[PDB]
Every structure is written in structure tokens, then in C-alpha cells.
Amino acid sequence: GNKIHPIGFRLGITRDWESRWYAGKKQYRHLLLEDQRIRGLLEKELYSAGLARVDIERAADNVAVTVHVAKPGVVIGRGGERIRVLREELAKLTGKNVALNVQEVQNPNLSAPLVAQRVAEQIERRFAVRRAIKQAVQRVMESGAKGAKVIVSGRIGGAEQARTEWAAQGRVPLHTLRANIDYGFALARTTYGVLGVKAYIFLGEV
Amino acid sequence: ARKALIEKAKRTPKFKVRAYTRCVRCGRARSVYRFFGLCRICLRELAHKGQLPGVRKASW
Amino acid sequence: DFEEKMILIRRTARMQAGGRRFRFGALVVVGDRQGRVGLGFGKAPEVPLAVQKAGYYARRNMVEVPLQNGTIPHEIEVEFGASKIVLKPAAPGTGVIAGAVPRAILELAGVTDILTKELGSRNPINIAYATMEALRQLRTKADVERLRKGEAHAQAQ
RNA sequence: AACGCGUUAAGCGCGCCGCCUGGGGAGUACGGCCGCAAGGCUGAAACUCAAAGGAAUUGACGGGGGCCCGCACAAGCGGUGGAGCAUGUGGUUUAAUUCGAAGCAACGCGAAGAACCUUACCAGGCCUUGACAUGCUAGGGAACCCGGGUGAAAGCCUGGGGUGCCCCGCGAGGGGAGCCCUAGCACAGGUGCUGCAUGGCCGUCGUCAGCUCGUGCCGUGAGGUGUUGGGUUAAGUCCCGCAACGAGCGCAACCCCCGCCGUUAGUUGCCAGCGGUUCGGCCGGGCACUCUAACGGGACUGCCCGCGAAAGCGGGAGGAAGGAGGGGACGACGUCUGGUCAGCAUGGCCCUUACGGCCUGGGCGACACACGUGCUACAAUGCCCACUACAAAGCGAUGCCACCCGGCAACGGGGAGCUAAUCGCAAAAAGGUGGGCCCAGUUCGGAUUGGGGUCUGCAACCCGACCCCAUGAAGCCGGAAUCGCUAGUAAUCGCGGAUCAG
Ligand SMILES: C[NH+](C)c1cc(NC(=O)CNC(C)(C)C)c(O)c2c1C[C@H]1C[C@H]3[C@H]([NH+](C)C)C(O)=C(C(N)=O)C(=O)[C@@]3(O)C(O)=C1C2=O
Ligand SMILES: [Mg+2]
Ligand SMILES: [Mg+2]
Ligand SMILES: [Mg+2]
Ligand SMILES: [Mg+2]
Ligand SMILES: [Mg+2]
Ligand SMILES: [Mg+2]
Ligand SMILES: [Mg+2]
Ligand SMILES: [Mg+2]
Ligand SMILES: [Mg+2]
Ligand SMILES: [Mg+2]
Ligand SMILES: [Mg+2]
Ligand SMILES: [Mg+2]
Ligand SMILES: [Mg+2]
Ligand SMILES: [Mg+2]
Ligand SMILES: [Mg+2]
Ligand SMILES: [Mg+2]
Ligand SMILES: [Mg+2]
Ligand SMILES: [Mg+2]
Ligand SMILES: [Mg+2]
Ligand SMILES: [Mg+2]
Ligand SMILES: [Mg+2]
Ligand SMILES: [Mg+2]
Ligand SMILES: [Mg+2]
Ligand SMILES: [Mg+2]
Ligand SMILES: [Mg+2]
Ligand SMILES: [Mg+2]
Ligand SMILES: [Mg+2]
Ligand SMILES: [Mg+2]
Ligand SMILES: [Zn+2]
């Protein structure tokens, strides 16, 4: 356990915070506590929609929950039917002005946490450990990314001896700040236990 | 976090002295910042996702 | 467009400070059963990356074969290492009698019938290009009286 | 086989000789033969093992060498080990003194705040769909809110106030959702175990210059080459050479801090000139400079002599900065089955009227000892009482508390300002001026005690901090051993923040 999280490095250097407000000492404590309910319910449900990055910008007791997600019509339903069910179930938890939008994950391979998920799924899915990770990466320099890398990391394939694996390609340079890379932590669950997964993608130097 | 022991600190107590905080996110009251309602493990873990606004990574 | 069997794979060891490290190696054939046939030997970090690579070397390492009614033109023997390879034509109906590895290479190269033995050392890889060479060296009732005699050829024929 | 052989063949063939036929037993036994003898020659088996071997490759290792670097040793400063106290820890003790950490890389470490709380521990009084989730069925109940009794508290027995919402209806009133109770069932919950079944995150060799792949080249191959040699570098940094050519993760740069300066800016900061001045940047006026944050500029071996194929190197000119200017974040493929199921996450074994739950009290602080970390000392380059200057950083409207009064004082009472460049913590301290002490167990030192008070808090006996008085212990600079630091560093002196009523 030697290295550092890539996102938490470029905190306003080549990335950005999800929750982007202000707050006082009185408010920040409670105000944030809220976001971690907003992002606990929102997640727990939206899973099989492929949810990515969850913005929560804030004005005077106006919450502004944007949502990037693989599949905008499993957030929606038919017509506008199921998005409403939630848009209030949040104002049910806040007690205020939930503006819960939707924004499609255009290219899905070119956004890490998704990439992480489908793999962690594929491991839950009892697939070919290696090939999962190979094709994982495969598609990433197939959609057109600068760099790719996936790190399967459990008791792998059902083995009693805990190991780890991976592969990659292209530029992976996390010591260049000015290189934008997205981290994806997933976390499969299989009969033998729990097998966290990682995925890093380079898009470009700026 | 013994589940019921988040609750012995949630509700208000017999006398006001017993008012010890805890983590909303995990229920370890051992090292908690009454500004995040969070501990040190959490605060990083989260800050490392940029999920706490304005929380930068420091250097001088 | 080349059909391609596979002969043998292995994991081999390097070493280092703290635990071993490895590499894998893949013996591969090729061959349009009417005439031609290659071999490769491929090493690479993860297995089928090698098996794929071994297929490469075989495409360049090709050997056209004198073939004659699905069989071998004369008799033949060759050494290479201490592994001693034998071939010998069989008649219509006797067919790829040969252990493990000539079969793989003879078949895909296109032999119906053949006789065969392996000798002393039996390590695949030697008997592999044991026979890649045994076959580089087959010679034909015409390739031949126009190696010799052919001093003054086309007065003879 | 490879090593190597290589017209001195281990190359290509002819003749003849002797010799081998798996390791151990074994060069033994039996027999013959030879010698004076010591012994030799010839030379087995029973039984037992899946080997015994041969060259060769990558490593690891050497009390083998060659060449580099780190406060690794030396050259220098200051300490520990000794003393008393503070904090962890080992061992004992305990009803329990809950847990885990284990050579450097466990030991002021999980604890960035154990009086109950925290709290997993122990002794008692207890709760059983349970402090918590989404529910199912039978029966009653709106939710809910007030009081008594018993009690160490919990807990239990019990008095009363209350009767909203949805649908149907003229109506009494039935149906329904919620929630409530009683009984039963799903199940909840566990800081029960295993870090040697995992996740993740951390430590570490190590900010060391290393770790590798592609295509090709070379070996039958594992594999090598590349990355090596010479020069250079904080470096696999780079220059030159080479059967190599490049790339991926590292080095490095892009990010922040400090150093110079320019652009936008003049409040709550600032005061060089002018006006007034209660002499206080106090007011008019100004934003010059200091500051104040945002963006840019600038350093490149660019210049010169020298050294050198080059990369580089040495000395200098200019410059605020010179060869990366100082500092930070930043930790490569992997190892130690290193760390924790005690933040959380989870396979599995395990209890589920009990390890689960609530409670008051007791405990992690116990003390024949031992280590590990630090504080203050043992004092004259000092101790002490006055007057006197010069800081940066951070916190504070459930708090910071200027002054005023009371008290020797802690502090209490009263009370102005401050969403904080405007008000406050705020006294900076070593330094400075002036004076007292004169080698003393001392005006050094400030333990441990006796008594008196203040504060936080339901509550200071275990078990708190602070005030005043009296007590004035060890220790006159520390055995063997051993630690840190290469410049604004070491030492020495003060301020601050987090945690948190204290
Ligand atoms: C005692 N041995 C047999 C042992 C056993 C286990 N685990 C088991 O037996 C569990 N096996 C099951 C699966 C339950 C059947 C073990 O799990 C271990 C060990 C060894 C220890 C050694 C540890 C040691 N120190 C700290 C006590 C040490 O010096 C090191 C080290 N290399 O520095 C360790 O690795 C050590 O801490 C350690 O990890 C051990 C084990 O893990
Ligand atoms: Mg738990
Ligand atoms: Mg408390
Ligand atoms: Mg031979
Ligand atoms: Mg043999
Ligand atoms: Mg020679
Ligand atoms: Mg034998
Ligand atoms: Mg020394
Ligand atoms: Mg344990
Ligand atoms: Mg207690
Ligand atoms: Mg471990
Ligand atoms: Mg252990
Ligand atoms: Mg272990
Ligand atoms: Mg370095
Ligand atoms: Mg070759
Ligand atoms: Mg080169
Ligand atoms: Mg190397
Ligand atoms: Mg070399
Ligand atoms: Mg390089
Ligand atoms: Mg003004
Ligand atoms: Mg004037
Ligand atoms: Mg760097
Ligand atoms: Mg160890
Ligand atoms: Mg303790
Ligand atoms: Mg007074
Ligand atoms: Mg006061
Ligand atoms: Mg003296
Ligand atoms: Mg140094
Ligand atoms: Mg202090
Ligand atoms: Zn926490």
C-alpha cells in the first residue's frame, strides 16, 4: 500500500469537486451530512442505470442535483413516469428545493467508474477473470482514450490463495499532474467474498 | 459502530455531559472533527473523491 | 488464411530478489495440407499472447514440401541435438503413424501415409525442428536427376 | 548436451585393444592370486532410494575483488542511559485491570482528549421482534402527552388528558393508511474468530535508481541482447560507443510555499508630501510604500577564460536568485503470507430469553520491577523583581471576552466591541535598561506532602485542572552502550491550532 488516489490529487488542478457550494461552520457539518444521504439513496437505486458523477451545486437552500448516467431512460421510465417518483423522494429527505436533472454518459468506456463497474459486475458474473480485464482495457483504446489500465484484486476465480492481476496500455502517467486521469473504484461480491477493482484512464495533457 | 451505540449518542442523554459526537459515515467517535461530523479515515477517504467542497490537498 | 495446430506450451522460470518471475513459451505448427507448413516457437509475458506470437514465426519459417500421393518421396533420417528423427514413406492406407509431434507437423503439412520413430532424447522442441529440417531436405525424382546429371541437362531430357 | 575441440581433433573414414551398462551399499563380503608385513589385484549380491549425475541460465550469497551514494563512519554541536515527574510498554496483580501493536519498519503508536459517557471489560438490577431495518398473521389500540408508586438507576405495576387522516354513508358507525400494544413468526444485532481465506488503506527496503515490453538480433533451449563498457549525473541524467531501435511504469518537469519584480486593487490595512489636530493615522485628503490575494515576468550552462570528441566540469561578469535557489505534495514492477476483521466493507466457523440490549457502580490509572519516549533540573553565559522593546501564523457571535469593581489570586459580578485586516485571545519569550543574589543542596532545583480556596460539571473518593499559604525530595552535568542534525539546519525561546464542558 504505497501510492495515491489520482482524483484526490488534482483537486482543482485538472479535475473538480462534485459537491460545489459554499458553507459556514454551522452549515457545512449538516449541509454535507445531507449530500451523503442524497448520494446514498440516489446510488442504491440508480445502479442498473449506470450512474457516474453526481454534482450537488448549492445556493440559498436550493439544492442542484445533476446526474451523469449511462442509461438516462432507466432514470426516466416511460414518458417522465419514474423520475418524478424520486425528484420528491429527495425533497422528502432534504425538506427543500431538489432540482434533480439528467445527463447521459455519452461515451461509456471513456468514463472510469462505469468501466470499473461492468468489470466488477463481470466478476460477480462468474466470467473469465483475465479476459474480463483485457477486453476491459481493450475497449478503452478502442473508444479512443490516451491510456488504459484495470486492476482486478481479490481471491480471484474462486481461489483460496488471494492474489491480484491486471494489464494496461498507452500513457498511464500519474506523476504528471497535467495529465487528466479518472479513477474507478468498483467492488464485486462473490460467494467467496469481496473483490475491489480499479480502472484508470488517461484522456489528455492540457 | 455497534449499531445501537451510534444510537446511544444520537438521542439526547440523561445529563448534558454525556454529549460525545460520532461519525455519520461509519460510527467511530475516536478521532472526530466537529466540523465534518466525520473522522480522519473518512475525511480523507471522501476528500480523496472531492466530495467535500473546497477541501484541497495541502502543501507549503 | 492458414490452418494452424498447436504442439506444446510451457511455463519457464526466471528469478529475482523476492519470488520468481516468468514467461511462457508456445510451440505452434501451420500448413495447407497440400504442400506447405511452418513452425514457430513463441515466448511472451501472458500465455495466448505467446501462442499468438508463435503463430507469427511460423508464417516466415515456411517449408514447401515435395509431396507425392500424400506421402514422402524417398526414405530419410536426421539428427539435431541427441534427438534422432526417422521418416519413411508409407503406402495408401497406412497413414500418419508417428508419435505426438511428427503427427502434428506431418498432418498439417499434408501427409496421408508415413512411417516414423523418435530417438534417444525426446524433447519436443528438438524433434520439432529435427523434422522441420528432415523436411527441408526431402528431394525429388526430378529435383534430383537435375542436381546430378544436369551438368548437361536437356540433352538428356 | 553445453563447456569447449579445433592439421597437437573432441572434424571426416580404416584396423586392433581395453573399458562402460542407474545412485547408495562398495572398492566391502566370498573365492582364488601376489607380498615378510602393511596390503594389493580380480571383484559380487541381498536390501534400500527415484534418483546419482553433466555441462549451462537468472538470481540470491562470500569472513572475493573492482567502481559510486546516504549525517553510513569520521571532522563538529547537543542529549539519552543516572536523577524526579509525564506518557506508552514488558512483566506481575486483579471480580475485571477490555483489545491490538512486536528487531530497525511495536513502545507520547490505534487514543487529534477514558471521572459516568466514551467502553468492547467486570459485579449487580434487568429487556426478549429486542437501542435498528423492510415486513407477515391473530386480536386491541389514533399518534400522542401529563402524574403517581417502588427504585442505585434502568425496569415494572399504574392514574388521566387525547381520539386527527383516507374511502363509503342521512346516520349511529364499519372498511383503510399510518403508527401503538400484546402473542407468534420472518429476522434484526455481535468491537464472537481467522489479517495465514479477502477488499481497501497504511508501513517498509526507498525518492533507492532502479522494473520491464515490442519488433529485430543471438543460443536446441531456459535465456541473452536492449539496460552492458568509457565519460557524466542527486538519477536508466545525459554525451560516445556498440545488434540493436523505441516505448510503458519510475527520475525529471506541469501544482503549492518561500526569494526579486511588473499588471488589475485601495477596505476593516497603509502614512512619504500638504491641511487641521483632544497628540492617538485621531480627522480632512491620499494610496505613494508596507501589507493585502489573483494573475503573469524571470535562469537557459545564456556570457566570458580554462578543461573536454561530447555530455559535463571549475573559476567569474551581470542578477534578488546560478547551475535543480531553499522547502512541500509526489513512492516504479515487487517483498516481508509485515499491519488491522477494533473505522467501514466481506467468505467462512460461531451466539441469537444471549457474547446480542438497557442500566447505576467498579475498571483500563492497579505496582516487589524493567525497558522504550519526553519534561524540568542539577544553575553564574545564571536565578530572581521591576521598567523596556521586535514576531509570524491560526481560532472566536451556542464563542473571543477589551475595561470596571471585589479578592493577595484562581476567578466571580457588571458590561462595551466582533458574521471577525475592523473587536478579542495577546503577555510574544529569550534580547534591552536598572537593581537584588555571590558557590550555597543554595533566592540552584521544584518533587512529595499538610491546610486553605476558585472553576468545569447531574457528579472530582477512586480519578481532574488551576489559586494562595506552609513542606523544599533526588539530582553539583551522569557506567558499559547509544541518538539527531550538513545552514537559517543544529541547538535555544515564545505563540498557535486541531481534539474537547473540563
Ligand atoms: C506461528 N506461525 C505458525 C504462524 C501461523 C499463522 N497462521 C495460522 O496458523 C493460521 N492457519 C489456519 C488457516 C487458521 C489453519 C500465521 O498467520 C503467522 C505465523 C508466523 C507469524 C510470525 C510473525 C513474527 N512476529 C511479529 C511475531 C514476524 O517476526 C514476522 C516477520 N516476518 O517480521 C511475521 O510475519 C509475523 O508477524 C506473522 O505474520 C506471522 C503469521 O502471520
Ligand atoms: Mg460491524
Ligand atoms: Mg464528551
Ligand atoms: Mg549424439
Ligand atoms: Mg535417453
Ligand atoms: Mg582454439
Ligand atoms: Mg544396483
Ligand atoms: Mg560522531
Ligand atoms: Mg482481535
Ligand atoms: Mg467506565
Ligand atoms: Mg498481511
Ligand atoms: Mg496478529
Ligand atoms: Mg501475519
Ligand atoms: Mg533521487
Ligand atoms: Mg534463435
Ligand atoms: Mg542506446
Ligand atoms: Mg535491469
Ligand atoms: Mg552486456
Ligand atoms: Mg529515461
Ligand atoms: Mg479611508
Ligand atoms: Mg503632518
Ligand atoms: Mg516528481
Ligand atoms: Mg516483523
Ligand atoms: Mg492507555
Ligand atoms: Mg482588584
Ligand atoms: Mg471573569
Ligand atoms: Mg553550583
Ligand atoms: Mg543532508
Ligand atoms: Mg504550545
Ligand atoms: Zn469516521
Side-chain angles (χ1 to χ4, degrees):
Chain A
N2 21 344
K3 27 195 179 337
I4 213 197
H5 219 261
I7 315 185
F9 185 16
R10 304 166 244 258
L11 308 175
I13 317 192
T14 306
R15 295 287 294 173
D16 191 27
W17 298 264
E18 286 171 303
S19 345
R20 11 185 309 196
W21 341 338
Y22 171 68
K25 344 154 181 162
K26 326 187 302 137
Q27 306 297 334
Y28 202 112
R29 169 184 183 90
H30 292 112
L31 263 262
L32 188 48
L33 135 78
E34 213 170 64
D35 298 40
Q36 317 293 141
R37 322 274 290 286
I38 311 192
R39 289 215 251 240
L41 177 67
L42 218 160
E43 270 210 11
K44 168 195 50 188
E45 308 247 347
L46 274 206
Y47 180 43
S48 307
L51 164 62
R53 270 171 30 59
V54 195
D55 287 54
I56 316 193
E57 335 176 41
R58 242 143 149 115
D61 272 316
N62 310 326
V63 192
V65 181
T66 309
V67 143
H68 300 86
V69 43
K71 304 141 76 153
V74 201
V75 203
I76 286 313
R78 206 179 309 101
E81 156 207 343
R82 114 100 162 180
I83 194 180
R84 230 186 56 261
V85 194
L86 324 158
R87 181 177 280 93
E88 281 158 81
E89 195 174 354
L90 298 176
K92 165 185 309 172
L93 256 17
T94 358
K96 51 211 126 228
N97 209 117
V98 179
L100 170 84
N101 307 27
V102 138
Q103 262 255 18
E104 197 185 359
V105 162
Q106 271 304 313
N107 222 322
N109 317 293
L110 304 214
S111 196
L114 202 175
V115 206
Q117 263 186 353
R118 181 194 210 139
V119 178
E121 261 163 47
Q122 288 192 52
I123 298 145
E124 285 168 326
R125 298 316 212 264
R126 218 125 296 119
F127 269 174
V129 198
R130 304 300 169 289
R131 287 200 300 165
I133 327 150
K134 278 275 158 227
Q135 290 125 21
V137 177
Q138 214 70 263
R139 265 177 289 123
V140 189
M141 343 240 44
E142 212 166 16
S143 310
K146 273 199 89 184
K149 189 183 269 175
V150 188
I151 298 79
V152 152
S153 325
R155 270 191 31 187
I156 300 151
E160 82 150 34
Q161 185 52 52
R163 31 212 194 106
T164 304
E165 225 78 26
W166 65 317
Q169 251 150 55
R171 319 239 351 219
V172 181
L174 54 162
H175 288 93
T176 13
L177 267 160
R178 78 200 221 183
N180 194 29
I181 303 105
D182 199 27
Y183 185 20
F185 185 34
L187 192 37
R189 320 150 163 82
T190 23
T191 353
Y192 36 87
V194 57
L195 326 168
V197 166
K198 311 155 186 288
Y200 304 63
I201 310 177
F202 188 16
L203 236 199
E205 298 197 339
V206 237
Chain B
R2 289 214 330 179
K3 261 245 184 169
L5 271 153
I6 317 175
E7 300 281 77
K8 198 188 299 170
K10 275 206 178 190
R11 63 143 176 84
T12 1
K14 258 317 163 101
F15 331 90
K16 237 261 172 157
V17 268
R18 305 178 161 188
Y20 72 90
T21 37
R22 203 174 287 261
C23 192
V24 270
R25 195 171 165 260
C26 51
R28 173 178 178 163
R30 254 294 160 213
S31 191
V32 171
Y33 287 89
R34 45 126 126 176
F35 171 87
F36 281 98
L38 285 168
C39 93
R40 45 172 187 72
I41 318 175
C42 278
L43 155 35
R44 212 161 65 94
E45 234 140 358
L46 282 165
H48 274 350
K49 304 131 165 307
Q51 281 181 18
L52 339 183
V55 109
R56 218 172 183 177
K57 238 285 289 308
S59 52
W60 68 110
Chain C
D1 191 50
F2 247 138
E3 138 147 55
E4 41 167 82
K5 230 243 202 63
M6 178 244 302
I7 300 274
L8 167 83
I9 256 187
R10 63 183 188 176
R11 166 170 122 188
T12 47
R14 279 186 4 171
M15 279 280 326
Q16 200 43 40
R20 27 211 137 266
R21 314 251 233 184
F22 322 76
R23 198 152 193 91
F24 312 110
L27 198 45
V28 143
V29 213
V30 154
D32 59 87
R33 328 202 164 206
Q34 336 102 60
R36 334 206 330 195
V37 60
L39 214 103
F41 182 92
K43 281 166 274 300
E46 280 197 24
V47 192
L49 221 179
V51 207
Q52 180 211 244
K53 229 146 89 188
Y56 196 168
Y57 300 143
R59 304 231 193 285
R60 326 137 45 154
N61 234 321
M62 285 292 296
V63 200
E64 2 275 81
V65 165
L67 273 179
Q68 282 168 181
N69 175 251
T71 218
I72 231 169
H74 38 67
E75 105 245 339
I76 231 175
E77 305 198 17
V78 202
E79 276 195 62
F80 166 123
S83 322
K84 181 154 183 132
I85 200 49
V86 161
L87 327 169
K88 168 185 186 173
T94 336
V96 185
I97 306 167
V101 201
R103 209 132 61 16
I105 301 161
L106 280 174
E107 242 167 32
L108 292 253
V111 194
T112 31
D113 325 282
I114 197 142
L115 274 107
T116 283
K117 190 74 204 46
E118 287 151 76
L119 271 152
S121 171
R122 295 258 181 72
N123 162 288
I125 336 197
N126 277 340
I127 334 200
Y129 9 43
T131 3
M132 295 322 265
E133 266 298 340
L135 294 165
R136 219 166 251 109
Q137 195 203 111
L138 323 137
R139 278 306 184 294
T140 320
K141 186 164 179 151
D143 287 351
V144 151
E145 22 142 34
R146 188 198 30 179
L147 202 51
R148 66 198 54 148
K149 193 195 304 182
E151 132 212 19
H153 210 203
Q155 172 161 343
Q157 290 153 331

